[PDB]
Design an enzyme around this catalytic site. Structure first.
Site, PDB file in Angstrom:
ATOM      1  N   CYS A 107       4.170  25.804   3.086  1.00 34.97           N
ATOM      2  CA  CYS A 107       4.863  27.073   3.282  1.00 34.97           C
ATOM      3  C   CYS A 107       4.745  27.573   4.712  1.00 34.97           C
ATOM      4  O   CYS A 107       3.656  27.915   5.163  1.00 34.97           O
ATOM      5  CB  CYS A 107       4.316  28.141   2.332  1.00 34.97           C
ATOM      6  SG  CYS A 107       5.073  29.795   2.514  1.00 34.97           S
ATOM      7  N   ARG A 110       3.446  31.759   5.494  1.00 31.18           N
ATOM      8  CA  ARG A 110       2.109  32.232   5.155  1.00 31.18           C
ATOM      9  C   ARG A 110       1.468  33.274   6.070  1.00 31.18           C
ATOM     10  O   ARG A 110       0.370  33.745   5.766  1.00 31.18           O
ATOM     11  CB  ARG A 110       1.167  31.038   5.077  1.00 31.18           C
ATOM     12  CG  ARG A 110       1.279  30.252   3.785  1.00 31.18           C
ATOM     13  CD  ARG A 110       0.283  29.114   3.811  1.00 31.18           C
ATOM     14  NE  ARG A 110       0.764  28.014   4.657  1.00 31.18           N
ATOM     15  CZ  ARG A 110       0.002  26.997   5.044  1.00 31.18           C
ATOM     16  NH1 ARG A 110      -1.274  26.958   4.676  1.00 31.18           N
ATOM     17  NH2 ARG A 110       0.506  26.024   5.793  1.00 31.18           N
ATOM     18  N   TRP A 279      11.108  36.243   0.656  1.00 30.20           N
ATOM     19  CA  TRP A 279      12.453  36.344   1.197  1.00 30.20           C
ATOM     20  C   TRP A 279      12.816  35.006   1.876  1.00 30.20           C
ATOM     21  O   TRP A 279      11.950  34.155   2.088  1.00 30.20           O
ATOM     22  CB  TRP A 279      12.553  37.504   2.167  1.00 30.20           C
ATOM     23  CG  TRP A 279      11.572  37.435   3.294  1.00 30.20           C
ATOM     24  CD1 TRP A 279      11.665  36.657   4.433  1.00 30.20           C
ATOM     25  CD2 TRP A 279      10.350  38.169   3.408  1.00 30.20           C
ATOM     26  NE1 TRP A 279      10.571  36.879   5.240  1.00 30.20           N
ATOM     27  CE2 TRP A 279       9.753  37.797   4.637  1.00 30.20           C
ATOM     28  CE3 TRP A 279       9.711  39.120   2.603  1.00 30.20           C
ATOM     29  CZ2 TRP A 279       8.540  38.332   5.062  1.00 30.20           C
ATOM     30  CZ3 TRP A 279       8.504  39.656   3.034  1.00 30.20           C
ATOM     31  CH2 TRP A 279       7.935  39.267   4.251  1.00 30.20           C
ATOM     32  N   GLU A 284      17.167  27.496   4.277  1.00 28.68           N
ATOM     33  CA  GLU A 284      16.993  27.167   2.865  1.00 28.68           C
ATOM     34  C   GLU A 284      18.329  27.195   2.161  1.00 28.68           C
ATOM     35  O   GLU A 284      18.646  26.309   1.369  1.00 28.68           O
ATOM     36  CB  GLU A 284      16.023  28.126   2.205  1.00 28.68           C
ATOM     37  CG  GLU A 284      14.600  27.931   2.650  1.00 28.68           C
ATOM     38  CD  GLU A 284      13.645  28.876   1.949  1.00 28.68           C
ATOM     39  OE1 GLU A 284      13.154  28.505   0.862  1.00 28.68           O
ATOM     40  OE2 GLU A 284      13.385  29.977   2.491  1.00 28.68           O
TER      41      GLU A 284
HETATM   42  C1  HEM Z   1       7.605  35.816   2.314  1.00 27.20           C
HETATM   43  C2  HEM Z   1       8.484  34.960   2.840  1.00 27.20           C
HETATM   44  C3  HEM Z   1       8.411  33.435   2.602  1.00 27.20           C
HETATM   45  C4  HEM Z   1       9.102  32.551   3.314  1.00 27.20           C
HETATM   46  C5  HEM Z   1      10.056  32.901   4.483  1.00 27.20           C
HETATM   47  C6  HEM Z   1       8.794  31.225   2.817  1.00 27.20           C
HETATM   48  C7  HEM Z   1       9.307  30.034   3.302  1.00 27.20           C
HETATM   49  C8  HEM Z   1       9.128  28.825   2.671  1.00 27.20           C
HETATM   50  C9  HEM Z   1       9.945  27.644   2.827  1.00 27.20           C
HETATM   51  C10 HEM Z   1      11.168  27.535   3.764  1.00 27.20           C
HETATM   52  C11 HEM Z   1       9.441  26.683   2.049  1.00 27.20           C
HETATM   53  C12 HEM Z   1      10.010  25.252   1.888  1.00 27.20           C
HETATM   54  C13 HEM Z   1      10.911  25.406   0.673  1.00 27.20           C
HETATM   55  C14 HEM Z   1      11.796  24.226   0.405  1.00 27.20           C
HETATM   56  O1  HEM Z   1      12.280  23.605   1.384  1.00 27.20           O
HETATM   57  O2  HEM Z   1      12.031  23.941  -0.802  1.00 27.20           O
HETATM   58  C15 HEM Z   1       8.295  27.232   1.345  1.00 27.20           C
HETATM   59  C16 HEM Z   1       7.486  26.581   0.441  1.00 27.20           C
HETATM   60  C17 HEM Z   1       6.532  27.134  -0.392  1.00 27.20           C
HETATM   61  N1  HEM Z   1       6.167  28.474  -0.487  1.00 27.20           N
HETATM   62 FE1  HEM Z   1       6.753  29.881   0.890  1.00 27.20          FE
HETATM   63  N2  HEM Z   1       7.887  31.352   1.776  1.00 27.20           N
HETATM   64  C18 HEM Z   1       7.634  32.709   1.611  1.00 27.20           C
HETATM   65  C19 HEM Z   1       6.802  33.287   0.676  1.00 27.20           C
HETATM   66  C20 HEM Z   1       5.999  32.673  -0.253  1.00 27.20           C
HETATM   67  C21 HEM Z   1       5.224  33.313  -1.314  1.00 27.20           C
HETATM   68  C22 HEM Z   1       5.150  34.838  -1.565  1.00 27.20           C
HETATM   69  C23 HEM Z   1       4.609  32.345  -2.004  1.00 27.20           C
HETATM   70  C24 HEM Z   1       3.631  32.429  -3.202  1.00 27.20           C
HETATM   71  C25 HEM Z   1       2.981  33.547  -3.557  1.00 27.20           C
HETATM   72  C26 HEM Z   1       4.982  31.086  -1.402  1.00 27.20           C
HETATM   73  C27 HEM Z   1       4.570  29.849  -1.820  1.00 27.20           C
HETATM   74  C28 HEM Z   1       5.161  28.657  -1.444  1.00 27.20           C
HETATM   75  C29 HEM Z   1       4.809  27.387  -2.021  1.00 27.20           C
HETATM   76  C30 HEM Z   1       3.740  27.138  -3.115  1.00 27.20           C
HETATM   77  C31 HEM Z   1       5.714  26.377  -1.311  1.00 27.20           C
HETATM   78  C32 HEM Z   1       5.767  24.857  -1.535  1.00 27.20           C
HETATM   79  C33 HEM Z   1       6.128  24.513  -2.965  1.00 27.20           C
HETATM   80  C34 HEM Z   1       6.049  23.012  -3.083  1.00 27.20           C
HETATM   81  O3  HEM Z   1       4.959  22.425  -2.831  1.00 27.20           O
HETATM   82  O4  HEM Z   1       7.091  22.408  -3.439  1.00 27.20           O
HETATM   83  N3  HEM Z   1       5.839  31.316  -0.358  1.00 27.20           N
HETATM   84  N4  HEM Z   1       8.136  28.541   1.753  1.00 27.20           N
HETATM   85  C1  LIG Z   2      15.140  20.305  -4.126  1.00 26.63           C
HETATM   86  N1  LIG Z   2      14.097  21.343  -4.020  1.00 26.63           N
HETATM   87  C2  LIG Z   2      12.915  20.974  -4.827  1.00 26.63           C
HETATM   88  C3  LIG Z   2      11.626  21.181  -4.031  1.00 26.63           C
HETATM   89  C4  LIG Z   2      10.760  22.257  -4.679  1.00 26.63           C
HETATM   90  C5  LIG Z   2      10.187  22.062  -5.944  1.00 26.63           C
HETATM   91  C6  LIG Z   2       9.398  23.063  -6.517  1.00 26.63           C
HETATM   92  C7  LIG Z   2       8.850  22.923  -7.677  1.00 26.63           C
HETATM   93  N2  LIG Z   2       8.293  22.818  -8.692  1.00 26.63           N
HETATM   94  C8  LIG Z   2       9.177  24.251  -5.826  1.00 26.63           C
HETATM   95  C9  LIG Z   2       9.740  24.443  -4.582  1.00 26.63           C
HETATM   96  O1  LIG Z   2       9.490  25.628  -3.959  1.00 26.63           O
HETATM   97  C10 LIG Z   2       9.979  25.910  -2.648  1.00 26.63           C
HETATM   98  C11 LIG Z   2       9.787  27.386  -2.372  1.00 26.63           C
HETATM   99  C12 LIG Z   2       8.801  28.118  -3.032  1.00 26.63           C
HETATM  100  C13 LIG Z   2       8.660  29.478  -2.768  1.00 26.63           C
HETATM  101  C14 LIG Z   2       9.491  30.089  -1.832  1.00 26.63           C
HETATM  102  C15 LIG Z   2       9.363  31.433  -1.548  1.00 26.63           C
HETATM  103  C16 LIG Z   2       8.332  32.256  -2.277  1.00 26.63           C
HETATM  104  C17 LIG Z   2      10.202  32.016  -0.605  1.00 26.63           C
HETATM  105  C18 LIG Z   2      11.158  31.240   0.040  1.00 26.63           C
HETATM  106  N3  LIG Z   2      11.981  31.789   0.970  1.00 26.63           N
HETATM  107  N4  LIG Z   2      11.272  29.928  -0.263  1.00 26.63           N
HETATM  108  C19 LIG Z   2      10.464  29.349  -1.173  1.00 26.63           C
HETATM  109  C20 LIG Z   2      10.612  28.005  -1.447  1.00 26.63           C
HETATM  110  C21 LIG Z   2      10.531  23.460  -4.000  1.00 26.63           C
END
Ligand code: HEM
Ligand SMILES: CNCCc1cc(C#N)cc(OCc2ccc3c(C)cc(N)nc3c2)c1
Ligand code: HEM
Ligand SMILES: CNCCc1cc(C#N)cc(OCc2ccc3c(C)cc(N)nc3c2)c1
Ligand SMILES: C[C@H](O)[C@H](O)[C@H]1CNc2nc(N)[nH]c(=O)c2N1
Ligand SMILES: C[C@H](O)[C@H](O)[C@H]1CNc2nc(N)[nH]c(=O)c2N1
Ligand SMILES: [Zn+2]
Lengths: 408, 415
Positions: A107, A110, A279, A284
């Site tokens: 992420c 963070r 957000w 994305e």
């Molecule tokens: C607040 C603004 C946030 C932004 C701008 C942001 C941005 C991102 C982006 C761009 C990704 C990659 C997503 C993808 O390509 O599928 C990501 C992944 C992730 N985010 Fe954040 N995020 C935010 C908040 C959060 C919050 C609030 C949480 C949890 C409480 C969180 C947990 C995660 C997790 C667990 C992943 C990876 C999931 C995986 O392993 O597939 N994010 N985030």
């Molecule tokens: C083809 N896409 C599949 C990859 C993916 C799988 C899973 C799961 N399970 C969860 C994923 O989470 C990405 C993610 C998680 C949280 C986000 C938050 C909280 C904000 C944000 N702007 N993007 C997020 C993006 C992504």
């Protein structure tokens, strides 16, 4: 060992000590690296894990080995002994949720990790209860465009036959329909989920952007359908600041990204239902959601309206269209005062966040493959930033889709 | 370690199975508790006899297996001949056939190279008879002329003598055969390529009289047999260059940018059967982004995004206007157009990544795998709209291989 990471643009060198605390495997070995692979209890298992978490909690509040600390250890021990599990205190739940986000190596957002609104839904018992809780989450997080990060946590796993699950992959997503002529209407990512909703009774509008119903499972029972009240679903029509014809494309998206299919793990306890939202970073939507071949796949349409020569790849017509789409998305959200961050600002913040964590925490686990944006990589600062990836707990984990497990 | 590892492409659903990783030789830097996949680089003494035998046998075995003569009389004889050489001289010499095989396979094994579909088409120049810097200069000039081929570029490697005691190394001190000078000014600014300021300063100390321009081709600094390095000017007629223009923006030429046609990396070490070739310049042709994104738009490089954006009259006060992205695309469009117009071989990042996927697939089927470093394979712009973005890869180190080595000025014992 103390491990160093260098930024090749600024030559800054940080030192990682934090990695020494991880106990969970990453998937790599000494001879093979799997950094680009997407995915590589009992009482006796549970107490050491609980003790580890309690210890880092009381360590975090600078009262390690306190009277309160010692009592909690004993309290937890007796409770595992007599019930094969235990319940987190509210303070612990919140600490646990913030740190799962903190530890999320993939992420880029963070820097915000400790501004997380935690909704405790562990007293929930039915799909209707879940729906109420999710509606409140959505309303609170959306905040009329001024988005606020939140997580709603439903009861922990018990025996595995009474799981709470949100079957949707996000709280808000668009339907996808497999067409007679072999093509796809709407979002091809969700074709399977859409079909399950249809089979369960949902009457599909069969449009390009239909908001899916919620499909909710409580205490291991069959899941039930619910429609999110439309006034809670904030959406943005996509237009372009220069191209008057862009709005004629008919594109839109929703303001609130809320992932609902992951598993939250805290002190050995498993929370199989924990939708969390924040957000968007514009890419994305603008790069992945709109331009993946297996998603909405709009590059050809846009490039055509741009009257670009599409015959040879070396004209970079895809790359031109990609940038314009992403311009439109940022402009659209910003014009409607819906919180969004561009990948320059976001990655910038992440570098500053890394510096914070290395100072106060001795490191920051980070996954270069996911952190670097899907466009314009090397003109963002994270491209040149060496990162170390390792797994800290509490964490968010992947879990299998419920329709592969559940028997009705 | 498991016998079969699977990789998936998340766009096509194609799943490939890797068995080749079982032949992995040296460590990657990762452990099971940490991944160092984004680290750029995870003593003066040489291989002993005991260290050397099994590495040589390993290579000879692999060579004879490749030509379908494993266990043959020739194989056993070559084994015995090698074993005796190592025993009496503590080293051994490769046959020409082995040398060519090893060089082709070091490229084939190079996990960070997106261009490997071409690996079997490599012209190997054997320079193991070279004794002096003048001779190295002769060999390098011939290499450049052949590889450039008036713009129809041909991939090639020139291999100078292997290492003996480590006090007689052959080295090209340049990082590439053809690169532009960088000059730090008293006021803190840089003229030319900031990436090369250090090497440039070395050349100037060594006697080079610098033109002090924006695009001055550096001299070769060549070390034979462990002696002090010597300077040589490459005949300018041998250095093909392309002025950068734009199919639509007529003002783009007024920026006065150009680049050279031949990417020829010269500071890596080639390792074959435990033998170390410290001077082994190899060259191919460019992927556009190597010039258009990294060389031109890296902040610590030519850093032209701003000047280009002003001529495009973009609003540059808000990052969310994506003026950087918009400018980046046009620059890369220009580079591809200028090279193609001048009929100098170049490949765009879409074509190259698609060829690499087809290449990888074929390797999985015919070889049991293909080591690939996603962090390097995915292009520095437009990552996810290229097919390598969605492709799971396994990274691991096979031998023969190209390796990093310390900069020679840091280790050289001046006479
Ligand atoms: C607040 C603004 C946030 C932004 C701008 C942001 C941005 C991102 C982006 C761009 C990704 C990659 C997503 C993808 O390509 O599928 C990501 C992944 C992730 N985010 Fe954040 N995020 C935010 C908040 C959060 C919050 C609030 C949480 C949890 C409480 C969180 C947990 C995660 C997790 C667990 C992943 C990876 C999931 C995986 O392993 O597939 N994010 N985030
Ligand atoms: C083809 N896409 C599949 C990859 C993916 C799988 C899973 C799961 N399970 C969860 C994923 O989470 C990405 C993610 C998680 C949280 C986000 C938050 C909280 C904000 C944000 N702007 N993007 C997020 C993006 C992504
Ligand atoms: C023929 C056309 C070729 C193309 C289009 C090509 C393309 C590339 C690109 C884009 C990179 C990344 C470079 C960077 O970002 O610094 C790379 C790396 C590399 N290439 Fe190729 N290459 C080609 C030929 C060759 C040849 C002939 C060899 C060796 C015989 C080779 C060996 C390597 C090695 C060892 C690396 C990684 C170096 C490192 O680890 O830093 N390539 N290639
Ligand atoms: C500015 N960062 C430099 C990273 C780098 C270091 C070394 C070394 N030593 C070698 C490198 O080689 C990259 C490379 C090597 C060979 C190439 C060939 C043969 C063709 C081509 N188009 N690009 C190459 C690119 C790169
Ligand atoms: C920190 C990171 O490993 C470093 O910036 C790498 C990333 N990927 C790269 N990829 C290529 N092709 N070339 C590079 O120089 C780099 N640099
Ligand atoms: C195969 C590869 O790991 C996969 O396509 C990854 C690459 N990096 C990514 N990075 C982000 N942020 N999101 C993704 O879905 C992916 N996909
Ligand atoms: Zn790894």
């Amino acid at each position: 060992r103390f491990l160093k990471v260098k930024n090749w643009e600024t030559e800054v060198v940080l030192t990682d000590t934090l990695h020494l605390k991880s106990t969970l495997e990453t998937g790599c070995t000494e001879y093979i690296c799997m950094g680009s692979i997407m995915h590589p209890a009992t009482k006796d298992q549970l107490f050491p894990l609980a003790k580890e978490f309690i210890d880092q909690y009381y360590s975090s509040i600078k009262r390690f080995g306190s009277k309160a600390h010692m009592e909690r250890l004993e309290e937890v021990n007796k409770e595992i002994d007599t019930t094969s599990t235990y319940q987190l205190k509210d303070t612990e739940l919140i600490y646990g949720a913030k740190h799962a986000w903190r530890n999320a190596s993939r992420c880029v957002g963070r820097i915000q990790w400790s501004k997380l609104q935690v909704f405790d839904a562990r007293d929930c018992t039915t799909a209707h209860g879940m729906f109420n809780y999710i509606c409140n989450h959505v309303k609170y997080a959306t905040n009329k465009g001024n988005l606020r990060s939140a997580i709603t946590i439903f009861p922990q796993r018990t025996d595995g036959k009474h799981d709470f699950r949100v079957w949707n992959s996000q709280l808000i997503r668009y339907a996808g329909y497999k067409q007679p002529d072999g093509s796809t209407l709407g979002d091809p990512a969700n074709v399977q989920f859409t079909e399950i909703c249809i089979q369960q009774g949902w009457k599909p509008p069969r449009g390009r952007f239909d908001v899916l119903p919620l499909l909710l499972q409580a205490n291991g029972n069959d899941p039930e359908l619910f429609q999110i009240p439309p006034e809670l679903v904030l959406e943005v029509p996509i237009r372009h600041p220069k191209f008057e014809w862009f709005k004629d494309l008919g594109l839109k998206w929703y303001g609130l990204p809320a992932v609902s299919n992951m598993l939250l793990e805290i002190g050995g306890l498993e929370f199989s239902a924990c939708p969390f939202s924040g957000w968007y970073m514009g890419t994305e939507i603008g790069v992945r959601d709109y331009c993946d071949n297996s998603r909405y796949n709009i590059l050809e349409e846009v490039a055509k309206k741009m009257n670009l020569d599409m015959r040879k790849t070396s004209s970079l017509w895809k790359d031109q269209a990609l940038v314009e789409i992403n311009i439109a998305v940022l402009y659209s959200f910003q014009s409607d005062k819906v919180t969004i961050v561009d990948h320059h600002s976001a990655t910038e913040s992440f570098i500053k966040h890394m510096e914070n964590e290395y100072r106060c925490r001795g490191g920051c686990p980070a996954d270069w493959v996911w952190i670097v944006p899907p466009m314009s990589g090397s003109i963002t600062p994270v491209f040149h930033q060496e990162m170390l990836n390792y797994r800290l707990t509490p964490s968010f984990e992947y879990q299998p889709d419920p329709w592969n497990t559940h028997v009705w």
